[PDB]
JSON list of N, CA, C and O in Angstrom, two decimals:
[
{"chain": "O", "resi": 2470, "resn": "UNK", "atom": "N", "xyz": [100.29, 111.06, 83.69]},
{"chain": "O", "resi": 2470, "resn": "UNK", "atom": "CA", "xyz": [99.75, 112.26, 82.99]},
{"chain": "O", "resi": 2470, "resn": "UNK", "atom": "C", "xyz": [100.60, 112.58, 81.84]},
{"chain": "O", "resi": 2470, "resn": "UNK", "atom": "O", "xyz": [100.21, 113.13, 80.76]},
{"chain": "O", "resi": 2471, "resn": "UNK", "atom": "N", "xyz": [101.99, 112.44, 81.95]},
{"chain": "O", "resi": 2471, "resn": "UNK", "atom": "CA", "xyz": [102.77, 112.68, 80.76]},
{"chain": "O", "resi": 2471, "resn": "UNK", "atom": "C", "xyz": [102.41, 111.68, 79.59]},
{"chain": "O", "resi": 2471, "resn": "UNK", "atom": "O", "xyz": [102.46, 112.14, 78.40]},
{"chain": "O", "resi": 2472, "resn": "UNK", "atom": "N", "xyz": [102.36, 110.43, 79.96]},
{"chain": "O", "resi": 2472, "resn": "UNK", "atom": "CA", "xyz": [101.97, 109.38, 78.84]},
{"chain": "O", "resi": 2472, "resn": "UNK", "atom": "C", "xyz": [100.64, 109.86, 78.19]},
{"chain": "O", "resi": 2472, "resn": "UNK", "atom": "O", "xyz": [100.67, 109.76, 76.99]},
{"chain": "O", "resi": 2473, "resn": "UNK", "atom": "N", "xyz": [99.65, 110.23, 79.00]},
{"chain": "O", "resi": 2473, "resn": "UNK", "atom": "CA", "xyz": [98.42, 110.70, 78.48]},
{"chain": "O", "resi": 2473, "resn": "UNK", "atom": "C", "xyz": [98.54, 111.79, 77.54]},
{"chain": "O", "resi": 2473, "resn": "UNK", "atom": "O", "xyz": [97.88, 112.00, 76.62]},
{"chain": "O", "resi": 2474, "resn": "UNK", "atom": "N", "xyz": [99.30, 112.80, 77.86]},
{"chain": "O", "resi": 2474, "resn": "UNK", "atom": "CA", "xyz": [99.64, 113.96, 77.11]},
{"chain": "O", "resi": 2474, "resn": "UNK", "atom": "C", "xyz": [100.22, 113.60, 75.83]},
{"chain": "O", "resi": 2474, "resn": "UNK", "atom": "O", "xyz": [99.91, 114.06, 74.81]},
{"chain": "O", "resi": 2475, "resn": "UNK", "atom": "N", "xyz": [101.23, 112.68, 75.86]},
{"chain": "O", "resi": 2475, "resn": "UNK", "atom": "CA", "xyz": [101.93, 112.22, 74.62]},
{"chain": "O", "resi": 2475, "resn": "UNK", "atom": "C", "xyz": [101.11, 111.29, 73.86]},
{"chain": "O", "resi": 2475, "resn": "UNK", "atom": "O", "xyz": [101.46, 110.99, 72.70]},
{"chain": "O", "resi": 2476, "resn": "UNK", "atom": "N", "xyz": [99.95, 110.75, 74.34]},
{"chain": "O", "resi": 2476, "resn": "UNK", "atom": "CA", "xyz": [99.15, 109.92, 73.58]},
{"chain": "O", "resi": 2476, "resn": "UNK", "atom": "C", "xyz": [97.67, 110.38, 73.68]},
{"chain": "O", "resi": 2476, "resn": "UNK", "atom": "O", "xyz": [96.86, 109.84, 74.26]},
{"chain": "O", "resi": 2477, "resn": "UNK", "atom": "N", "xyz": [97.36, 111.62, 72.96]},
{"chain": "O", "resi": 2477, "resn": "UNK", "atom": "CA", "xyz": [96.06, 112.17, 73.18]},
{"chain": "O", "resi": 2477, "resn": "UNK", "atom": "C", "xyz": [94.98, 111.38, 72.34]},
{"chain": "O", "resi": 2477, "resn": "UNK", "atom": "O", "xyz": [93.85, 111.46, 72.67]},
{"chain": "O", "resi": 2478, "resn": "UNK", "atom": "N", "xyz": [95.47, 110.59, 71.41]},
{"chain": "O", "resi": 2478, "resn": "UNK", "atom": "CA", "xyz": [94.34, 109.87, 70.66]},
{"chain": "O", "resi": 2478, "resn": "UNK", "atom": "C", "xyz": [93.76, 108.64, 71.50]},
{"chain": "O", "resi": 2478, "resn": "UNK", "atom": "O", "xyz": [92.58, 108.20, 71.16]},
{"chain": "O", "resi": 2479, "resn": "UNK", "atom": "N", "xyz": [94.53, 108.06, 72.43]},
{"chain": "O", "resi": 2479, "resn": "UNK", "atom": "CA", "xyz": [94.02, 106.98, 73.27]},
{"chain": "O", "resi": 2479, "resn": "UNK", "atom": "C", "xyz": [94.78, 107.05, 74.65]},
{"chain": "O", "resi": 2479, "resn": "UNK", "atom": "O", "xyz": [95.93, 106.65, 74.62]},
{"chain": "O", "resi": 2480, "resn": "UNK", "atom": "N", "xyz": [94.23, 107.73, 75.68]},
{"chain": "O", "resi": 2480, "resn": "UNK", "atom": "CA", "xyz": [94.95, 107.81, 76.94]},
{"chain": "O", "resi": 2480, "resn": "UNK", "atom": "C", "xyz": [95.17, 106.51, 77.63]},
{"chain": "O", "resi": 2480, "resn": "UNK", "atom": "O", "xyz": [94.89, 105.44, 77.11]},
{"chain": "O", "resi": 2481, "resn": "UNK", "atom": "N", "xyz": [95.91, 106.78, 78.89]},
{"chain": "O", "resi": 2481, "resn": "UNK", "atom": "CA", "xyz": [96.21, 105.39, 79.45]},
{"chain": "O", "resi": 2481, "resn": "UNK", "atom": "C", "xyz": [94.99, 104.56, 79.84]},
{"chain": "O", "resi": 2481, "resn": "UNK", "atom": "O", "xyz": [93.96, 105.20, 80.30]},
{"chain": "O", "resi": 2482, "resn": "UNK", "atom": "N", "xyz": [94.95, 103.25, 79.67]},
{"chain": "O", "resi": 2482, "resn": "UNK", "atom": "CA", "xyz": [93.91, 102.36, 80.02]},
{"chain": "O", "resi": 2482, "resn": "UNK", "atom": "C", "xyz": [94.04, 102.02, 81.42]},
{"chain": "O", "resi": 2482, "resn": "UNK", "atom": "O", "xyz": [95.07, 101.93, 82.10]},
{"chain": "O", "resi": 2483, "resn": "UNK", "atom": "N", "xyz": [92.91, 101.61, 82.13]},
{"chain": "O", "resi": 2483, "resn": "UNK", "atom": "CA", "xyz": [92.85, 101.27, 83.48]},
{"chain": "O", "resi": 2483, "resn": "UNK", "atom": "C", "xyz": [93.64, 99.92, 83.81]},
{"chain": "O", "resi": 2483, "resn": "UNK", "atom": "O", "xyz": [94.20, 99.72, 84.86]},
{"chain": "O", "resi": 2484, "resn": "UNK", "atom": "N", "xyz": [93.70, 98.99, 82.82]},
{"chain": "O", "resi": 2484, "resn": "UNK", "atom": "CA", "xyz": [94.50, 97.85, 82.98]},
{"chain": "O", "resi": 2484, "resn": "UNK", "atom": "C", "xyz": [96.05, 98.27, 83.07]},
{"chain": "O", "resi": 2484, "resn": "UNK", "atom": "O", "xyz": [96.74, 97.81, 83.97]},
{"chain": "O", "resi": 2485, "resn": "UNK", "atom": "N", "xyz": [96.50, 99.04, 82.02]},
{"chain": "O", "resi": 2485, "resn": "UNK", "atom": "CA", "xyz": [97.94, 99.42, 82.06]},
{"chain": "O", "resi": 2485, "resn": "UNK", "atom": "C", "xyz": [98.14, 100.18, 83.19]},
{"chain": "O", "resi": 2485, "resn": "UNK", "atom": "O", "xyz": [99.25, 100.21, 83.95]},
{"chain": "O", "resi": 2486, "resn": "UNK", "atom": "N", "xyz": [97.31, 101.15, 83.67]},
{"chain": "O", "resi": 2486, "resn": "UNK", "atom": "CA", "xyz": [97.32, 101.97, 84.94]},
{"chain": "O", "resi": 2486, "resn": "UNK", "atom": "C", "xyz": [97.52, 101.03, 86.09]},
{"chain": "O", "resi": 2486, "resn": "UNK", "atom": "O", "xyz": [98.34, 101.30, 86.99]},
{"chain": "O", "resi": 2487, "resn": "UNK", "atom": "N", "xyz": [96.69, 100.01, 86.26]},
{"chain": "O", "resi": 2487, "resn": "UNK", "atom": "CA", "xyz": [96.81, 99.11, 87.27]},
{"chain": "O", "resi": 2487, "resn": "UNK", "atom": "C", "xyz": [98.21, 98.42, 87.49]},
{"chain": "O", "resi": 2487, "resn": "UNK", "atom": "O", "xyz": [98.87, 98.48, 88.41]},
{"chain": "O", "resi": 2488, "resn": "UNK", "atom": "N", "xyz": [98.66, 97.88, 86.19]},
{"chain": "O", "resi": 2488, "resn": "UNK", "atom": "CA", "xyz": [99.89, 97.27, 86.28]},
{"chain": "O", "resi": 2488, "resn": "UNK", "atom": "C", "xyz": [101.00, 98.27, 86.59]},
{"chain": "O", "resi": 2488, "resn": "UNK", "atom": "O", "xyz": [101.94, 97.94, 87.33]},
{"chain": "O", "resi": 2489, "resn": "UNK", "atom": "N", "xyz": [101.07, 99.37, 85.92]},
{"chain": "O", "resi": 2489, "resn": "UNK", "atom": "CA", "xyz": [102.11, 100.38, 86.11]},
{"chain": "O", "resi": 2489, "resn": "UNK", "atom": "C", "xyz": [102.10, 100.86, 87.65]},
{"chain": "O", "resi": 2489, "resn": "UNK", "atom": "O", "xyz": [103.28, 100.82, 88.18]},
{"chain": "O", "resi": 2490, "resn": "UNK", "atom": "N", "xyz": [100.95, 101.18, 88.27]},
{"chain": "O", "resi": 2490, "resn": "UNK", "atom": "CA", "xyz": [101.05, 101.58, 89.71]},
{"chain": "O", "resi": 2490, "resn": "UNK", "atom": "C", "xyz": [101.35, 100.51, 90.62]},
{"chain": "O", "resi": 2490, "resn": "UNK", "atom": "O", "xyz": [102.15, 100.74, 91.69]},
{"chain": "O", "resi": 2491, "resn": "UNK", "atom": "N", "xyz": [100.99, 99.25, 90.21]},
{"chain": "O", "resi": 2491, "resn": "UNK", "atom": "CA", "xyz": [101.29, 98.31, 91.00]},
{"chain": "O", "resi": 2491, "resn": "UNK", "atom": "C", "xyz": [102.79, 97.96, 91.20]},
{"chain": "O", "resi": 2491, "resn": "UNK", "atom": "O", "xyz": [103.35, 97.76, 92.18]},
{"chain": "O", "resi": 2492, "resn": "UNK", "atom": "N", "xyz": [103.49, 98.00, 89.99]},
{"chain": "O", "resi": 2492, "resn": "UNK", "atom": "CA", "xyz": [104.85, 97.91, 89.96]},
{"chain": "O", "resi": 2492, "resn": "UNK", "atom": "C", "xyz": [105.68, 99.15, 90.50]},
{"chain": "O", "resi": 2492, "resn": "UNK", "atom": "O", "xyz": [106.62, 98.94, 91.30]},
{"chain": "O", "resi": 2493, "resn": "UNK", "atom": "N", "xyz": [105.06, 100.37, 90.36]},
{"chain": "O", "resi": 2493, "resn": "UNK", "atom": "CA", "xyz": [105.76, 101.45, 90.79]},
{"chain": "O", "resi": 2493, "resn": "UNK", "atom": "C", "xyz": [105.60, 101.51, 92.25]},
{"chain": "O", "resi": 2493, "resn": "UNK", "atom": "O", "xyz": [106.66, 102.08, 92.97]},
{"chain": "O", "resi": 2494, "resn": "UNK", "atom": "N", "xyz": [104.71, 101.02, 93.07]},
{"chain": "O", "resi": 2494, "resn": "UNK", "atom": "CA", "xyz": [104.55, 100.98, 94.35]},
{"chain": "O", "resi": 2494, "resn": "UNK", "atom": "C", "xyz": [105.56, 100.18, 94.98]},
{"chain": "O", "resi": 2494, "resn": "UNK", "atom": "O", "xyz": [106.41, 100.46, 95.87]},
{"chain": "O", "resi": 2495, "resn": "UNK", "atom": "N", "xyz": [105.88, 98.92, 94.35]},
{"chain": "O", "resi": 2495, "resn": "UNK", "atom": "CA", "xyz": [107.08, 98.07, 94.88]},
{"chain": "O", "resi": 2495, "resn": "UNK", "atom": "C", "xyz": [108.38, 98.95, 94.67]},
{"chain": "O", "resi": 2495, "resn": "UNK", "atom": "O", "xyz": [109.22, 98.88, 95.54]},
{"chain": "O", "resi": 2496, "resn": "UNK", "atom": "N", "xyz": [108.42, 99.42, 93.54]},
{"chain": "O", "resi": 2496, "resn": "UNK", "atom": "CA", "xyz": [109.78, 100.20, 93.14]},
{"chain": "O", "resi": 2496, "resn": "UNK", "atom": "C", "xyz": [110.03, 101.22, 94.12]},
{"chain": "O", "resi": 2496, "resn": "UNK", "atom": "O", "xyz": [111.14, 101.41, 94.65]},
{"chain": "O", "resi": 2497, "resn": "UNK", "atom": "N", "xyz": [109.01, 102.13, 94.31]},
{"chain": "O", "resi": 2497, "resn": "UNK", "atom": "CA", "xyz": [109.14, 103.14, 95.33]},
{"chain": "O", "resi": 2497, "resn": "UNK", "atom": "C", "xyz": [109.36, 102.72, 96.62]},
{"chain": "O", "resi": 2497, "resn": "UNK", "atom": "O", "xyz": [110.02, 103.39, 97.55]},
{"chain": "O", "resi": 2498, "resn": "UNK", "atom": "N", "xyz": [108.64, 101.56, 97.15]},
{"chain": "O", "resi": 2498, "resn": "UNK", "atom": "CA", "xyz": [108.96, 100.99, 98.41]},
{"chain": "O", "resi": 2498, "resn": "UNK", "atom": "C", "xyz": [110.29, 100.72, 98.65]},
{"chain": "O", "resi": 2498, "resn": "UNK", "atom": "O", "xyz": [111.05, 101.09, 99.76]},
{"chain": "O", "resi": 2499, "resn": "UNK", "atom": "N", "xyz": [110.95, 99.97, 97.64]},
{"chain": "O", "resi": 2499, "resn": "UNK", "atom": "CA", "xyz": [112.47, 99.86, 97.80]},
{"chain": "O", "resi": 2499, "resn": "UNK", "atom": "C", "xyz": [113.24, 100.99, 97.88]},
{"chain": "O", "resi": 2499, "resn": "UNK", "atom": "O", "xyz": [114.06, 101.13, 98.94]},
{"chain": "O", "resi": 2500, "resn": "UNK", "atom": "N", "xyz": [113.00, 101.88, 96.97]},
{"chain": "O", "resi": 2500, "resn": "UNK", "atom": "CA", "xyz": [113.98, 103.08, 96.90]},
{"chain": "O", "resi": 2500, "resn": "UNK", "atom": "C", "xyz": [113.62, 104.06, 97.84]},
{"chain": "O", "resi": 2500, "resn": "UNK", "atom": "O", "xyz": [114.55, 105.03, 98.19]},
{"chain": "O", "resi": 2501, "resn": "UNK", "atom": "N", "xyz": [112.52, 103.98, 98.74]},
{"chain": "O", "resi": 2501, "resn": "UNK", "atom": "CA", "xyz": [112.37, 104.80, 99.89]},
{"chain": "O", "resi": 2501, "resn": "UNK", "atom": "C", "xyz": [112.73, 104.17, 101.17]},
{"chain": "O", "resi": 2501, "resn": "UNK", "atom": "O", "xyz": [113.28, 104.83, 102.16]},
{"chain": "O", "resi": 2502, "resn": "UNK", "atom": "N", "xyz": [112.57, 102.88, 101.34]},
{"chain": "O", "resi": 2502, "resn": "UNK", "atom": "CA", "xyz": [112.99, 102.19, 102.51]},
{"chain": "O", "resi": 2502, "resn": "UNK", "atom": "C", "xyz": [114.57, 101.83, 102.53]},
{"chain": "O", "resi": 2502, "resn": "UNK", "atom": "O", "xyz": [115.20, 102.28, 103.41]},
{"chain": "O", "resi": 2503, "resn": "UNK", "atom": "N", "xyz": [114.89, 101.11, 101.62]},
{"chain": "O", "resi": 2503, "resn": "UNK", "atom": "CA", "xyz": [116.34, 100.52, 101.50]},
{"chain": "O", "resi": 2503, "resn": "UNK", "atom": "C", "xyz": [117.20, 101.49, 100.72]},
{"chain": "O", "resi": 2503, "resn": "UNK", "atom": "O", "xyz": [118.18, 101.24, 100.34]},
{"chain": "O", "resi": 2504, "resn": "UNK", "atom": "N", "xyz": [116.58, 102.68, 100.30]},
{"chain": "O", "resi": 2504, "resn": "UNK", "atom": "CA", "xyz": [117.36, 103.79, 99.55]},
{"chain": "O", "resi": 2504, "resn": "UNK", "atom": "C", "xyz": [118.47, 104.29, 100.50]},
{"chain": "O", "resi": 2504, "resn": "UNK", "atom": "O", "xyz": [119.47, 104.72, 99.94]},
{"chain": "O", "resi": 2505, "resn": "UNK", "atom": "N", "xyz": [118.59, 104.09, 101.86]},
{"chain": "O", "resi": 2505, "resn": "UNK", "atom": "CA", "xyz": [119.70, 104.48, 102.65]},
{"chain": "O", "resi": 2505, "resn": "UNK", "atom": "C", "xyz": [120.69, 103.42, 102.96]},
{"chain": "O", "resi": 2505, "resn": "UNK", "atom": "O", "xyz": [121.55, 103.72, 103.76]},
{"chain": "O", "resi": 2506, "resn": "UNK", "atom": "N", "xyz": [120.48, 102.18, 102.63]},
{"chain": "O", "resi": 2506, "resn": "UNK", "atom": "CA", "xyz": [121.16, 100.96, 102.91]},
{"chain": "O", "resi": 2506, "resn": "UNK", "atom": "C", "xyz": [122.06, 100.55, 101.92]},
{"chain": "O", "resi": 2506, "resn": "UNK", "atom": "O", "xyz": [122.13, 100.98, 100.68]},
{"chain": "O", "resi": 2507, "resn": "UNK", "atom": "N", "xyz": [122.86, 99.60, 102.23]},
{"chain": "O", "resi": 2507, "resn": "UNK", "atom": "CA", "xyz": [123.87, 98.99, 101.31]},
{"chain": "O", "resi": 2507, "resn": "UNK", "atom": "C", "xyz": [123.06, 98.13, 100.21]},
{"chain": "O", "resi": 2507, "resn": "UNK", "atom": "O", "xyz": [121.89, 98.07, 100.18]},
{"chain": "O", "resi": 2508, "resn": "UNK", "atom": "N", "xyz": [123.84, 97.53, 99.31]},
{"chain": "O", "resi": 2508, "resn": "UNK", "atom": "CA", "xyz": [123.18, 96.86, 98.14]},
{"chain": "O", "resi": 2508, "resn": "UNK", "atom": "C", "xyz": [122.78, 95.47, 98.70]},
{"chain": "O", "resi": 2508, "resn": "UNK", "atom": "O", "xyz": [121.65, 95.01, 98.31]},
{"chain": "O", "resi": 2509, "resn": "UNK", "atom": "N", "xyz": [123.49, 94.87, 99.56]},
{"chain": "O", "resi": 2509, "resn": "UNK", "atom": "CA", "xyz": [123.09, 93.62, 100.20]},
{"chain": "O", "resi": 2509, "resn": "UNK", "atom": "C", "xyz": [121.70, 93.77, 100.85]},
{"chain": "O", "resi": 2509, "resn": "UNK", "atom": "O", "xyz": [120.82, 92.84, 100.85]},
{"chain": "O", "resi": 2510, "resn": "UNK", "atom": "N", "xyz": [121.56, 94.83, 101.74]},
{"chain": "O", "resi": 2510, "resn": "UNK", "atom": "CA", "xyz": [120.34, 94.99, 102.42]},
{"chain": "O", "resi": 2510, "resn": "UNK", "atom": "C", "xyz": [119.23, 95.58, 101.60]},
{"chain": "O", "resi": 2510, "resn": "UNK", "atom": "O", "xyz": [117.96, 95.21, 101.78]},
{"chain": "O", "resi": 2511, "resn": "UNK", "atom": "N", "xyz": [119.48, 96.21, 100.48]},
{"chain": "O", "resi": 2511, "resn": "UNK", "atom": "CA", "xyz": [118.50, 96.35, 99.39]},
{"chain": "O", "resi": 2511, "resn": "UNK", "atom": "C", "xyz": [117.95, 95.09, 98.97]},
{"chain": "O", "resi": 2511, "resn": "UNK", "atom": "O", "xyz": [116.83, 94.90, 98.67]},
{"chain": "O", "resi": 2512, "resn": "UNK", "atom": "N", "xyz": [119.01, 94.20, 98.57]},
{"chain": "O", "resi": 2512, "resn": "UNK", "atom": "CA", "xyz": [118.51, 92.81, 98.18]},
{"chain": "O", "resi": 2512, "resn": "UNK", "atom": "C", "xyz": [117.62, 92.00, 99.16]},
{"chain": "O", "resi": 2512, "resn": "UNK", "atom": "O", "xyz": [116.80, 91.37, 98.95]},
{"chain": "O", "resi": 2513, "resn": "UNK", "atom": "N", "xyz": [118.16, 92.23, 100.49]},
{"chain": "O", "resi": 2513, "resn": "UNK", "atom": "CA", "xyz": [117.31, 91.69, 101.53]},
{"chain": "O", "resi": 2513, "resn": "UNK", "atom": "C", "xyz": [115.93, 92.08, 101.54]},
{"chain": "O", "resi": 2513, "resn": "UNK", "atom": "O", "xyz": [114.91, 91.31, 101.60]},
{"chain": "O", "resi": 2514, "resn": "UNK", "atom": "N", "xyz": [115.58, 93.48, 101.51]},
{"chain": "O", "resi": 2514, "resn": "UNK", "atom": "CA", "xyz": [114.34, 93.93, 101.57]},
{"chain": "O", "resi": 2514, "resn": "UNK", "atom": "C", "xyz": [113.61, 93.51, 100.34]},
{"chain": "O", "resi": 2514, "resn": "UNK", "atom": "O", "xyz": [112.31, 93.28, 100.37]},
{"chain": "O", "resi": 2515, "resn": "UNK", "atom": "N", "xyz": [114.24, 93.51, 99.04]},
{"chain": "O", "resi": 2515, "resn": "UNK", "atom": "CA", "xyz": [113.60, 93.02, 98.00]},
{"chain": "O", "resi": 2515, "resn": "UNK", "atom": "C", "xyz": [113.11, 91.57, 98.04]},
{"chain": "O", "resi": 2515, "resn": "UNK", "atom": "O", "xyz": [112.14, 91.22, 97.61]},
{"chain": "O", "resi": 2516, "resn": "UNK", "atom": "N", "xyz": [113.94, 90.75, 98.76]},
{"chain": "O", "resi": 2516, "resn": "UNK", "atom": "CA", "xyz": [113.59, 89.40, 98.89]},
{"chain": "O", "resi": 2516, "resn": "UNK", "atom": "C", "xyz": [112.32, 89.43, 99.84]},
{"chain": "O", "resi": 2516, "resn": "UNK", "atom": "O", "xyz": [111.38, 88.48, 99.60]},
{"chain": "O", "resi": 2517, "resn": "UNK", "atom": "N", "xyz": [112.31, 90.12, 100.96]},
{"chain": "O", "resi": 2517, "resn": "UNK", "atom": "CA", "xyz": [111.14, 90.15, 101.82]},
{"chain": "O", "resi": 2517, "resn": "UNK", "atom": "C", "xyz": [109.92, 90.51, 101.10]},
{"chain": "O", "resi": 2517, "resn": "UNK", "atom": "O", "xyz": [108.79, 90.12, 101.17]}
]
């Protein structure tokens, strides 16, 4: 929504939205699940 507000002339496209949220879901998965663990185990979850 912030990006759409900062780009009123052409808002977020569905392709960019798809890519952004697909990557953000993995990023948030890592930082929610392995956010309580060491760096090695964060790497383990990233590998899985």
